[PDB]
Subunit: 259 residues, 4 copies
Amino acid sequence: MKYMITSKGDEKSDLLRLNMIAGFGEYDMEYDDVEPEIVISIGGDGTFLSAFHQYEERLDEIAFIGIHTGHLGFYADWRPAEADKLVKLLAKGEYQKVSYPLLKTTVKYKEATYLALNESTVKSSGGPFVVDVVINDIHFERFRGDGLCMSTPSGTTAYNKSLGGALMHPSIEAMQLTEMASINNRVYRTIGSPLVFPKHHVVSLQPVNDKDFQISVDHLSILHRDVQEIRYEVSAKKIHFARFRSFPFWRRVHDSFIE
Amino acid sequence: MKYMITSKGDEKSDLLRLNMIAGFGEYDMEYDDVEPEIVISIGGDGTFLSAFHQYEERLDEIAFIGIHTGHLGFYADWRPAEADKLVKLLAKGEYQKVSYPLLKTTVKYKEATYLALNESTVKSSGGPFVVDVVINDIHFERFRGDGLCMSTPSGTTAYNKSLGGALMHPSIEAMQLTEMASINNRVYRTIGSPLVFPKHHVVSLQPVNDKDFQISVDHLSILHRDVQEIRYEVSAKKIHFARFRSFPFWRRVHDSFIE
Amino acid sequence: MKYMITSKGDEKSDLLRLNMIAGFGEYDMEYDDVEPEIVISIGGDGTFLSAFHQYEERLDEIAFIGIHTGHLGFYADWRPAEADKLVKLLAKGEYQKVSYPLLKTTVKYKEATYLALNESTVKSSGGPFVVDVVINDIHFERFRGDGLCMSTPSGTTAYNKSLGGALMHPSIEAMQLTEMASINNRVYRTIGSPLVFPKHHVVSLQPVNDKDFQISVDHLSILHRDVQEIRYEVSAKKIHFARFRSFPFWRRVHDSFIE
Amino acid sequence: MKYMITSKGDEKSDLLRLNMIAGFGEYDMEYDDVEPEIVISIGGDGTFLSAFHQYEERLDEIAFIGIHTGHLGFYADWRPAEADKLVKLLAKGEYQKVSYPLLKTTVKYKEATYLALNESTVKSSGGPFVVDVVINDIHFERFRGDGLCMSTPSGTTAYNKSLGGALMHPSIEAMQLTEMASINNRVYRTIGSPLVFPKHHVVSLQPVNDKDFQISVDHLSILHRDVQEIRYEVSAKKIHFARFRSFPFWRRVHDSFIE
Ligand SMILES: CN(CC#Cc1nc2c(N)ncnc2n1[C@@H]1O[C@H](CNC(=O)Nc2cccc3ccccc23)[C@@H](O)[C@H]1O)C[C@H]1O[C@@H](n2cnc3c(N)ncnc32)[C@H](O)[C@@H]1O
Ligand SMILES: CN(CC#Cc1nc2c(N)ncnc2n1[C@@H]1O[C@H](CNC(=O)Nc2cccc3ccccc23)[C@@H](O)[C@H]1O)C[C@H]1O[C@@H](n2cnc3c(N)ncnc32)[C@H](O)[C@@H]1O
Ligand SMILES: CN(CC#Cc1nc2c(N)ncnc2n1[C@@H]1O[C@H](CNC(=O)Nc2cccc3ccccc23)[C@@H](O)[C@H]1O)C[C@H]1O[C@@H](n2cnc3c(N)ncnc32)[C@H](O)[C@@H]1O
Ligand SMILES: CN(CC#Cc1nc2c(N)ncnc2n1[C@@H]1O[C@H](CNC(=O)Nc2cccc3ccccc23)[C@@H](O)[C@H]1O)C[C@H]1O[C@@H](n2cnc3c(N)ncnc32)[C@H](O)[C@@H]1O
C-alpha cells in the first residue's frame, strides 16, 4: 500500500530510510508522499511531529509509525534494529490501529484553527501576559503570569510535565491546562492547580489590555496580532498509530523517566 | 417518597432539619432512614461524606443533596435559605440525576474492599513508607516517601489538590494518584508528576519490607496489619446527586478558590 | 538636604508629588534630581525600581523611600495619607538607614555588568534554552528549559516566588536561583530545587550551542548576542532605605499575600 | 588523641571499624567513648545522625567524620577505601574544622529543648493539624495541613528538599520552614512558599484546638501531650567537622542528585 518516510536528516536516519525503501521494493509497496496511507518517521519525537503536521489534513486515512535513532521517544517507539521486522508486517497488514485524541485551537481576530499533537501555548509579545480565562462561557479567573499550556493526553509527558501537570493515559479524551509562573497575591488570584477538561468543553482566553501574543503549536510558534479570542477544545479528529507489539503507555513512561 | 436527613449536630443544622421534616409532612413524604430514596445532608462536606458512607450499599437507589450551613462545600452546594424551595421540588420530583465516579480500594492480607468519594490514602505505620507501584501488572517505580493519595474526580479539589494534583471535571471516569514528599536521588527515582488513570486500569501497591500501613478512605483511617496488596481501580458503582438548578463544577471551583 | 521625587505619572501620584514639594519648601530642603541624598518614589514597586536604576551609581549616598498609590508594595511601604508626616521627619533627619543586598550580573562576549534589586533572568532568543551551570568553577548541571531566575533576598517575594522559590529575609546576604520548566528525563537531569548561594559564591552560566539569550534585570530586558558567559554573585553594593516606623519584612509579607 | 567510632551494625561496617582501631593502635590514639575529641561514623547519614545525638552535649569539643559504606551521604563523605589514609592524618592532626549551624526546638507545656542536624518536624496526633504561625511575636498565618518542617542549612538536602524547599549552602546561618499539603481556599490561606529565617529570628507555633502533636527531630519522633508552644530558632551551638580533602557542598549536591 502507499507509504512515505520522513527522516531527521542526519547520516543514521537517511541511511536507514534508504534501506527500508529498498526493503519495501521487495514487496509491491508504492512510495507516494502525496497520498500515503502509512507514514514512517525516523529520528526523534520532533521528527514525528513534523510528519504529523505535514499530513494533518489526511489524519483519518493514515497510520503513523515512529522509529527513534537517538533516544526513545513517546511517538518514536521503535528501535532502528527492528526496521526489517517492521517492513514485513507493514507490507502484509494485519495490524490494529490505535487513536490518540488531539487538541483544537481557534484564534479569532478572520479566524485561524490549529491541530496539536503535544500542546498549544500562549505567551505575551513582551511584558506582562494577562488573560481572562473563560470556561463554557463562565468567567473563571484573571491570569497574570508568563503564559498557559493546553496539552493533549499524549502531550502531558512533554511541556505539560515540566509545568507540574499531571500525566494522563491517552485513552482519556481530554485536555489539560497548566500555568507558567502565575503571580498570586491579594490582588491577583489564580487556581494554581492544573486543570483537566473533558470533551465538548470550551476553554476561551480573552485579552485584557495587550492584544499581541506569541502562540505555539508543537513545533511552530507564530506571533499573532490583534487577538480577540483563543479557543481550546478536544478535537473531533484523532491521530492513528499502527501498533504491532504491545508497548503500553505506562511502560513507555517508565522507560523514559524512571529507568 | 422515602427520605432521610443527616445533620452536622450543631444548633443551626439541627433546627433546619426539623423545619424541613415539618415541611415534608405537608406532603406525603415518609421519613425512613432504613430504605430512603433521597438523602439530604446538612452541614459541610464532612457531613455529606458521612451520609454517603452510611448508605454506600444502596447507592444505586439514592439521590444525594447537600446543604452547607458553614461555608460552601463541593457536595453541599445549597444554602440554608433555599431549604423551603428545595423541599417543594423534592416532593414532586421532575429532577434529573447526575452521577460522579467512585474509587474502589482492595486490601489483601482475607481481602477487604472500600468505596471512596474523595480519595484513598496510604502511609507508613511509623518510619519509612516504601511500596512498589505496579500498573496493569507492570512494575512502574519503587516509591519511598510519606505516602500516596488516589483521588476520585470530585475528590481532586480536596486532598489531591493540596498535593499538587490536577483538578478534573467529574464527568471523566478516572482516578488520580499523587505523591507525598517522595525522596529522589541517584538511588531512588519516582515519576513525581501526578498520574491520571482511566477506567479498567488497576494500580497495585506492593510492600517491600514493612507490611503495616495506615490506610484512610475519606473520613475513616484504620491501621492495616500484614498487608500483601493494595488495589486501586475506578469503581463500577456511581454516586447519584439530585440536581435542580445549574451549578457547574467549574463555577463551584471558582467560588471555592478564586472569589 | 538635597532630594528628588519620582512619580508614576497618573493624576494621583503627580498631585501628591507637588504637595510634598510644597511641603518641603516650608523647610530648607533643596530639590536636586542630579545629586539627591533622598529619593522618594510615588506609585508602585515598578516606579520604585525605576528610581533605583535612575541613581544606581550613587547608591552609597542615597536613602530611598516608597509610597504606594495603588496597592501596597514591598518597597513602596507608605500610604499616601502619611505623606505630610513623612515630609516632617525627612526634613529633620534622625532616621536610621536599612540596607538590602543587591545582585551583580556580568555578561561577557567586552563585558557588561548590571545591578538588580529584584532579580536577573535569562531566556533563549527563540527555541531551546540550554546552559551549563557552573558553581565556583565546578560543573553542576546542564540545564534545558525555559530559563533561569537569580533573585536578590528582597526579590524573592517577586518573580522568584512565582517560580516556587523560597522567601528569605533581606538581612541574609545571599542570592537564589530558580528554574523555569526544566525538562527532566533519563537524558537531561537538573536539581529542580531552588538554590540559595551565599556571598562570594560565583554562579556562571555557559552556553552549549545557541549563544543568543534574552536577559532581563528588573524592568529592562535586552537581547544579548554572542554571549560567552553570564556571572552571578552577591554585589558588594547595597541599597539603603530610610525607615521611620517599624514595618517588619514578615509583616509586609503577611499583608501582601495572607490578609 | 581521644576518639571513638560508631558502626552501622552490618558486617562491612563492623569489620572496617576493627581495622581502623588496629590502625589507631599503631599510634598513641586512646579509644574513649565517654570523652572523645574525634567521632568517626561508619555506615550512612542515619548512622552519622545517631553519632551526633550521642554526643550532642559536647559538640564544642568534637570534630565529626563520616564514612559511607552504602551510597554517598552528605555527612558520610568518605569512602571505605580511604580509611587507612584517614587514620594517618587523624593521628597527626593538622586538619581544619568546618562548622555547620544547628536548629534549636523548644516545646513548652515544664519545657523541653532539642538540637537537630537535619530538621524538626511537627504533625498532628490524628486528624487535622492546625497551628497559628507566629514570627517574632507577629501573627503570620493560620496553617491547616499535614505538618511543617523546619530544616537546618545542611538538612535542606533531606526532607526539606522533598517538600519543595530550597537547598542552601551550610555557611548561611539560617533555618528553612516548608509546608506539608496545606489546604488553601477562600477560608484558609497560607503563604505556600518555603520561608528562610535568619539567626535570632524566633518562629513560634501555637495550637488552635488539638494540643497533641507528633514532633520529630532527625531520627527520633515522640508524641507530645498538652503542648502550649513550639519555638524554632537558629541554635548558638554548631557541629564541627574534620575536613582533610576539598569536597565542596555543591559538588556533594551534584554527586548525590545529578550524576
Ligand atoms: C513591573 N514589575 C515591577 C515590580 C515589582 C515587584 N517587586 C516585588 C518584590 N520585590 N516583592 C514583592 N512583590 C514585588 N513586586 C510586585 O510586582 C507587581 C507588578 N509586577 C508585575 O506584574 N510583573 C509581572 C507579572 C507577570 C508577568 C510579567 C511579565 C513581564 C514583566 C513583569 C511581569 C507589583 O504589584 C509589585 O507588588 C517588574 C517585576 O515583575 C516581576 N515579574 C516578572 N514576571 C513575573 C511573573 N511571571 N510572576 C511574578 N512576577 C513577575 C519581576 O520580578 C520584576 O521585578
Ligand atoms: C533515616 N534518615 C537518616 C538520614 C538522612 C539524610 N540526611 C541528609 C542530608 N542532610 N542531606 C542529604 N541527604 C540526607 N539524608 C539521606 O536520607 C537517606 C535515608 N533517609 C530516609 O530514607 N528517610 C526517610 C525517607 C522517606 C520516609 C521516611 C520516613 C520516616 C523516616 C525517614 C524517612 C540517606 O540515604 C541519606 O542520603 C533520617 C532522615 O530521613 C529524612 N526524611 C524523613 N522523611 C523523609 C521524606 N519523606 N523524604 C525525604 N527524606 C525524609 C529526615 O530528614 C531524616 O533526617
Ligand atoms: C522539539 N520538541 C520535539 C518534541 C517532543 C516531545 N514530545 C513528547 C511527548 N509527547 N511525550 C514525552 N516526551 C516528548 N517529547 C520530548 O521532547 C524532547 C525534545 N524537545 C525539547 O527539548 N523541547 C524543548 C525543551 C526545552 C525548551 C524548549 C524550547 C523551545 C522548544 C522546545 C523546547 C524529545 O527528546 C522528546 O523525547 C518540541 C517539544 O518541546 C516541548 N517543550 C517545549 N518547551 C519545553 C520545556 N520548557 N520543557 C519541556 N518540554 C518543552 C514542547 O511540548 C514541544 O512539543
Ligand atoms: C473532614 N474532611 C471532610 C471534607 C471534605 C472535602 N471534600 C472536598 C472536595 N471533594 N472538594 C473540595 N473540597 C472538599 N472538602 C473540603 O474539606 C474541608 C474540611 N476538611 C479538612 O479540613 N480536611 C483536612 C484538612 C487538613 C488536614 C486534615 C487531616 C486529617 C483529616 C482531614 C484534614 C471542607 O471545608 C471541604 O470544603 C475530610 C477531607 O479532608 C481532606 N484532607 C485530608 N487531609 C488534607 C490535607 N492535608 N489538605 C487538604 N485536604 C485534606 C480529605 O480529602 C478528606 O476527604
